[PDB]
Amino acid sequence: DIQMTQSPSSLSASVGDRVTITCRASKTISKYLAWYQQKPGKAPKLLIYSGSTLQSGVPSRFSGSGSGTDFTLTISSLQPEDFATYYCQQHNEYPLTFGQGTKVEIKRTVAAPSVFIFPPSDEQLKSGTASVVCLLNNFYPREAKVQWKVDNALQSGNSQESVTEQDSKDSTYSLSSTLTLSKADYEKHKVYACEVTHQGLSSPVTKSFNRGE
Amino acid sequence: EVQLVESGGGLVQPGGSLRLSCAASGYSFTGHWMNWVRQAPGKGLEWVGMIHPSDSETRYNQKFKDRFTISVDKSKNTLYLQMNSLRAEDTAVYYCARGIYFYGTTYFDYWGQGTLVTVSSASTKGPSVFPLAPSSGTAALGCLVKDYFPEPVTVSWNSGALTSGVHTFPAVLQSSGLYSLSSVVTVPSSSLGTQTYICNVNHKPSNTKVDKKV
């Protein structure tokens, strides 16, 4: 099979930027590469096929070039409606194979998260489980590092995160991390801390509580 | 005009099976190859295989040949995907897509809306809702919507009176096979004495509704 390598995985750009998205094939695919645009919850839309041919109706700011193993999709000047995920797909042989995608998001200024920690509720403790939550609010860029500490012991494997998509008004992200402990383990320890590393922070920020306070 | 509509998606247990349908209208059905393409949540695209409605000639992606059967009923303008012995990795949105097989091999000019297939051994269950209490000039509170299946739940605040600064996070699939999600909101610290905060949680698949004061 042909393996398609797409770069970058992610790009934050501004309206008006020239955007360059690349796809490399593991072996030659001649001139036959297609490009698709996909918006969240929607099907992919065809933009370009055979490397450089625009599908009728596709705006002229989209263009494609390349041959053999190396190909490019260009958006000459980014528009608001262009923020989206783009995929390449070789059509030189079977099986048909796709790149892993390039997500194009809105560039804005660095913003440090506001950090908050929440203890488990007394009601939950009655069920025999403790969930401890850490919120990282309204930050940019998306990359950030949450480390859980229990009585200063670094936690591993017992937390899960999720992240919102860019806020429609301020283009920031928010993230919650949840540490899950048994009631017994929770009650064996005093200090619960969420330590946050981010580009906007000159040193890691720690938010903590004491069990029972 | 070309219209493609998938149906048949939903929940299935590991080791189960499902038949998906794609109704293709608005053009000559027997004139173009039809395709199935699948896309796991978060991920990119995988081509399943293709069929020509005229004579039911097929070509499969090798990886799918054992467990997936593509068929067609040209009299009904309908394409099918029979998926057998299902497993967690089969969880994906499944698209039917019309092929242009002309320049080299195939690219896809029209797509359906997609139908979601979710493979799970969990059992239908409404959530427990727990407060994320504001700590003793901006404060954060929220609710933890824990241990429900299947997706989705909805969360509002103060019956929709509170919308500014709300973040409701994507659900996380826990190791138990049940989902959890948090919804948070930032508010004026001054308000915590005076203003009431209630999260309104709905889980339609179990007909569960919960209001929790925070």
XYZ file of C-alpha atoms in Angstrom:
427
model
C 0.000 0.000 0.000
C 0.925 3.665 -0.359
C 1.433 5.522 2.915
C 0.551 9.218 2.727
C 2.426 11.540 5.084
C 0.724 14.889 5.635
C 2.289 17.985 7.247
C 1.767 19.963 9.345
C -0.640 18.097 11.629
C -1.932 21.458 12.848
C -1.544 25.097 11.833
C -2.790 28.297 13.422
C -3.120 31.035 10.839
C -4.800 34.379 10.286
C -7.301 35.468 7.640
C -5.240 36.636 4.632
C -2.290 34.268 5.175
C -0.856 32.084 2.441
C -1.291 28.512 3.695
C 0.843 25.611 2.428
C -0.137 22.010 3.224
C 2.086 19.133 2.091
C 1.552 15.450 1.343
C 4.282 12.950 0.702
C 3.666 9.498 -0.783
C 5.709 6.449 0.322
C 6.247 5.581 -3.357
C 5.318 7.443 -6.556
C 1.622 8.116 -7.184
C 2.307 9.836 -10.541
C 0.101 12.959 -10.748
C -2.905 11.423 -8.982
C -3.544 13.107 -5.658
C -6.873 14.460 -4.407
C -7.579 17.003 -1.665
C -10.646 17.275 0.585
C -11.901 19.844 3.083
C -13.852 18.723 6.156
C -15.730 20.766 8.756
C -16.748 19.300 12.149
C -19.697 16.901 11.957
C -19.788 17.149 8.163
C -18.652 14.906 5.314
C -15.481 15.684 3.352
C -15.818 17.938 0.308
C -13.685 17.430 -2.798
C -11.459 20.371 -3.721
C -8.786 19.110 -6.116
C -7.951 15.927 -8.026
C -5.022 14.754 -10.200
C -2.712 17.012 -8.150
C -3.839 20.352 -9.596
C -7.356 20.154 -11.118
C -10.035 22.118 -9.240
C -13.497 20.585 -8.976
C -16.049 22.957 -10.576
C -17.278 25.425 -7.950
C -14.108 25.394 -5.830
C -12.822 28.966 -5.270
C -9.680 30.004 -7.167
C -7.729 30.703 -3.952
C -7.299 26.901 -3.650
C -4.538 25.412 -5.804
C -2.509 22.191 -5.954
C 0.901 21.219 -7.282
C 3.385 18.364 -7.300
C 4.055 14.985 -8.862
C 5.679 11.650 -7.985
C 6.002 11.601 -4.197
C 5.729 15.281 -3.248
C 2.582 17.426 -3.355
C 1.227 20.709 -2.009
C -2.181 22.290 -1.400
C -2.059 26.094 -1.308
C -4.629 28.548 -0.022
C -3.350 31.841 -1.506
C -5.179 34.031 1.012
C -7.016 32.423 3.918
C -10.688 33.262 4.409
C -12.850 32.750 7.505
C -14.759 29.883 5.884
C -11.485 28.067 5.248
C -10.764 27.119 8.862
C -11.210 23.386 8.738
C -9.460 20.039 8.288
C -7.809 19.120 4.978
C -6.938 15.593 3.769
C -4.975 14.323 0.794
C -5.769 11.003 -0.911
C -3.755 9.149 -3.574
C -5.683 7.886 -6.596
C -2.924 6.173 -8.565
C -3.500 2.641 -7.246
C -5.662 0.407 -5.039
C -6.159 0.370 -2.165
C -7.068 4.045 -1.947
C -5.214 5.687 0.946
C -5.436 9.023 2.803
C -3.198 11.413 4.678
C -3.868 11.834 8.383
C -4.965 15.419 7.976
C -4.089 19.060 8.590
C -6.266 21.042 11.011
C -6.279 24.774 10.219
C -7.286 26.918 13.207
C -7.309 30.640 14.069
C -4.087 32.294 15.258
C -4.316 34.599 18.270
C -2.040 35.896 21.045
C -0.586 33.687 23.773
C -2.941 33.469 26.755
C -2.126 31.703 30.024
C -4.843 29.449 31.494
C -6.707 30.382 34.655
C -6.446 27.246 36.776
C -9.026 25.837 39.230
C -9.108 22.632 41.293
C -12.267 20.906 42.558
C -12.449 18.264 45.299
C -14.787 15.276 45.021
C -18.264 15.878 46.420
C -19.285 14.182 49.663
C -22.162 12.598 47.706
C -19.759 10.924 45.243
C -17.565 9.620 48.083
C -20.595 7.572 49.237
C -20.422 5.641 45.938
C -16.847 4.513 46.720
C -15.071 6.618 44.080
C -13.380 10.033 44.155
C -13.096 12.258 41.090
C -10.781 15.280 41.440
C -11.106 17.876 38.673
C -8.674 20.455 37.356
C -9.818 23.175 34.958
C -7.518 25.126 32.631
C -9.632 28.003 31.337
C -9.396 30.213 28.213
C -5.802 29.586 27.130
C -3.753 29.658 23.904
C -2.069 27.783 22.295
C -3.795 24.413 22.829
C -0.606 22.684 24.035
C -0.474 22.415 27.823
C 0.721 19.967 30.470
C -1.277 18.842 33.501
C 0.558 16.950 36.236
C -1.444 15.558 39.151
C 0.266 15.299 42.534
C -1.047 13.449 45.580
C 0.897 14.408 48.708
C 3.662 15.449 46.232
C 3.774 12.035 44.531
C 3.514 12.418 40.741
C 0.446 10.581 39.393
C 0.459 8.451 36.247
C -2.232 6.480 34.398
C -5.181 7.510 36.590
C -6.265 10.706 34.798
C -8.124 11.655 31.624
C -8.377 14.980 29.757
C -10.628 16.610 27.256
C -10.374 19.918 25.438
C -12.917 22.250 23.874
C -12.638 23.453 20.278
C -11.600 27.098 19.780
C -14.048 29.492 21.437
C -16.140 31.303 18.818
C -15.651 34.683 20.531
C -12.062 34.693 21.841
C -10.358 31.792 19.930
C -9.086 30.195 23.179
C -9.246 26.592 24.427
C -10.319 25.143 27.742
C -9.276 21.804 29.198
C -10.410 19.634 32.078
C -8.373 16.850 33.646
C -9.982 14.346 35.995
C -8.061 12.236 38.507
C -9.948 9.094 39.548
C -9.225 7.376 42.883
C -10.968 4.771 44.992
C -12.482 6.217 48.173
C -9.886 4.260 50.213
C -6.932 5.700 48.268
C -8.454 9.178 48.383
C -8.787 9.004 52.180
C -5.143 7.819 52.565
C -3.861 11.223 51.400
C -4.092 14.927 52.320
C -2.832 17.279 49.592
C -4.274 17.187 46.079
C -2.577 19.396 43.521
C -2.889 20.169 39.840
C 0.341 21.568 38.323
C 0.013 23.318 34.963
C 2.722 24.045 32.389
C 1.933 26.372 29.455
C 3.689 28.809 27.062
C 1.872 31.756 28.759
C 3.253 30.809 32.200
C 6.855 31.730 33.155
C 6.873 28.815 35.625
C 4.319 26.052 36.381
C 1.152 27.117 38.257
C -0.065 24.834 41.089
C -3.603 24.784 42.508
C -4.224 22.568 45.525
C -6.612 21.689 48.324
C -6.400 19.710 51.555
C -8.844 16.814 51.874
C -11.532 17.928 54.311
C -10.855 21.653 54.051
C -28.909 16.056 -8.525
C -26.748 13.521 -6.657
C -28.118 12.749 -3.187
C -26.576 10.088 -0.900
C -28.139 9.089 2.429
C -26.715 6.452 4.818
C -28.782 4.552 7.376
C -28.443 1.580 9.743
C -25.799 2.927 12.130
C -25.975 2.752 15.905
C -24.794 0.758 18.883
C -23.461 -2.786 18.519
C -21.744 -5.193 20.953
C -18.277 -6.710 20.301
C -18.840 -9.821 18.184
C -22.022 -8.328 16.750
C -22.872 -7.387 13.170
C -24.758 -4.672 11.313
C -25.960 -3.884 7.799
C -25.645 -0.267 6.642
C -27.688 1.139 3.738
C -26.954 3.988 1.329
C -29.811 5.342 -0.780
C -28.412 7.017 -3.882
C -30.802 9.262 -5.821
C -30.873 12.028 -8.443
C -28.559 10.555 -11.107
C -28.016 7.295 -13.045
C -27.110 4.774 -10.302
C -25.605 2.158 -12.639
C -23.242 4.733 -14.173
C -20.709 5.158 -11.326
C -18.805 3.016 -8.844
C -19.977 3.388 -5.246
C -17.688 3.357 -2.214
C -17.659 2.919 1.557
C -15.173 5.090 3.506
C -14.882 5.035 7.304
C -13.410 7.560 9.734
C -12.739 6.827 13.406
C -13.435 9.638 15.884
C -10.472 12.021 15.895
C -8.844 10.268 12.978
C -8.553 10.336 9.193
C -10.124 8.285 6.446
C -9.991 4.584 5.569
C -11.303 3.200 2.284
C -13.373 0.022 2.787
C -14.142 -0.963 -0.809
C -16.193 -0.342 -3.921
C -18.920 -1.862 -6.081
C -20.271 -1.183 -9.560
C -24.100 -1.202 -9.394
C -24.462 -2.375 -13.024
C -23.149 -5.934 -12.419
C -22.094 -5.893 -8.728
C -18.364 -6.171 -9.496
C -16.438 -5.449 -6.278
C -12.973 -4.443 -5.127
C -12.024 -4.510 -1.471
C -9.310 -3.047 0.656
C -7.520 -6.263 1.744
C -7.843 -5.310 5.453
C -11.642 -5.431 5.214
C -12.092 -8.512 2.986
C -12.601 -11.030 5.819
C -15.324 -9.202 7.742
C -16.998 -6.718 5.383
C -19.306 -7.486 2.445
C -20.426 -4.823 -0.048
C -23.546 -5.402 -2.110
C -26.055 -3.494 -4.198
C -29.695 -3.641 -5.263
C -29.680 -1.600 -8.455
C -33.502 -1.827 -8.671
C -33.692 0.155 -5.397
C -30.739 2.512 -6.109
C -29.296 1.192 -2.817
C -25.771 0.165 -1.707
C -25.115 -1.999 1.385
C -22.271 -2.711 3.807
C -22.527 -5.888 5.889
C -20.022 -5.634 8.758
C -19.369 -8.836 10.750
C -17.695 -9.908 14.014
C -17.345 -6.285 15.085
C -14.654 -4.915 17.393
C -13.722 -1.658 19.132
C -11.605 -0.463 16.165
C -14.717 -0.558 13.945
C -16.186 2.409 15.851
C -16.376 5.125 13.185
C -18.598 7.281 11.021
C -19.278 5.272 7.853
C -19.709 7.233 4.613
C -21.003 6.111 1.288
C -19.370 8.043 -1.527
C -19.635 8.113 -5.297
C -16.382 7.297 -7.069
C -14.858 8.935 -10.094
C -12.802 6.049 -11.492
C -11.261 7.657 -14.573
C -8.035 9.535 -13.781
C -5.828 6.740 -12.429
C -7.957 4.961 -9.823
C -10.725 6.530 -7.681
C -11.514 9.795 -5.897
C -14.820 10.748 -4.279
C -16.995 13.526 -5.696
C -20.188 13.107 -3.636
C -20.564 11.925 -0.043
C -23.409 10.993 2.280
C -23.871 12.620 5.693
C -22.349 9.548 7.367
C -23.783 7.094 9.870
C -22.119 6.449 13.237
C -21.344 2.916 14.407
C -20.301 2.545 18.058
C -18.959 -0.799 19.305
C -19.416 -1.257 23.054
C -19.993 -3.830 25.796
C -21.446 -1.216 28.196
C -25.110 -1.070 29.288
C -27.573 1.823 28.949
C -27.370 3.946 32.125
C -28.318 7.499 33.161
C -25.633 9.659 34.808
C -24.933 10.609 38.379
C -24.423 14.362 38.652
C -22.014 15.858 41.191
C -21.246 19.498 42.023
C -17.922 21.101 41.232
C -18.108 23.601 44.072
C -16.569 27.080 43.877
C -13.612 27.368 46.251
C -13.884 29.473 49.400
C -12.269 38.466 41.039
C -13.460 35.420 39.125
C -14.599 32.036 40.438
C -15.243 28.707 38.716
C -17.991 26.183 39.343
C -19.493 23.319 37.355
C -21.079 19.878 37.395
C -19.556 16.432 36.910
C -21.826 14.239 34.786
C -20.483 10.794 35.555
C -21.098 7.193 34.460
C -23.621 7.248 31.601
C -24.111 5.324 28.356
C -24.614 5.849 25.449
C -23.815 9.406 24.354
C -25.055 12.128 24.419
C -25.968 14.188 27.443
C -26.927 17.861 27.325
C -26.071 20.448 29.988
C -27.565 23.897 30.549
C -27.125 26.356 33.404
C -29.969 28.052 35.284
C -32.418 26.674 32.671
C -30.518 28.606 29.985
C -30.322 31.884 31.945
C -26.539 31.395 32.172
C -24.589 30.999 28.899
C -21.624 33.394 29.052
C -18.357 31.749 30.129
C -19.803 28.218 29.988
C -17.564 25.416 28.747
C -19.081 21.951 28.340
C -16.302 19.497 27.548
C -16.276 16.574 25.126
C -17.240 13.363 26.906
C -14.449 11.048 27.971
C -14.877 7.281 27.580
C -13.766 5.725 30.876
C -12.166 2.271 31.310
C -15.551 0.989 32.596
C -17.007 1.717 29.133
C -19.197 4.450 30.634
C -18.876 8.144 29.713
C -18.172 11.138 31.935
C -18.240 14.834 31.162
C -17.767 18.113 32.964
C -19.498 21.402 32.367
C -17.993 24.495 33.964
C -18.694 28.226 34.163
C -16.721 31.233 35.381
C -18.621 33.881 37.350
C -18.068 36.926 39.571
C -16.763 35.899 42.997
C -19.079 38.532 44.471
C -22.067 36.557 43.227
C -21.477 33.348 45.151
C -23.342 34.615 48.207
C -26.396 35.794 46.362
C -26.819 34.049 43.012
C -28.035 30.460 42.675
C -26.317 28.084 40.243
C -28.028 24.942 38.961
C -26.925 22.632 36.152
C -29.670 20.991 34.097
C -28.620 17.596 32.758
C -30.557 15.514 30.216
C -29.712 11.995 29.041
C -32.417 11.086 26.500
C -31.287 7.486 25.759
C -32.162 6.558 29.367
C -34.852 9.240 29.769
C -32.872 10.649 32.727
C -33.181 14.301 33.769
C -31.237 15.789 36.674
C -30.976 19.276 38.134
C -28.075 19.799 40.537
C -27.561 22.889 42.687
C -23.905 23.893 42.996
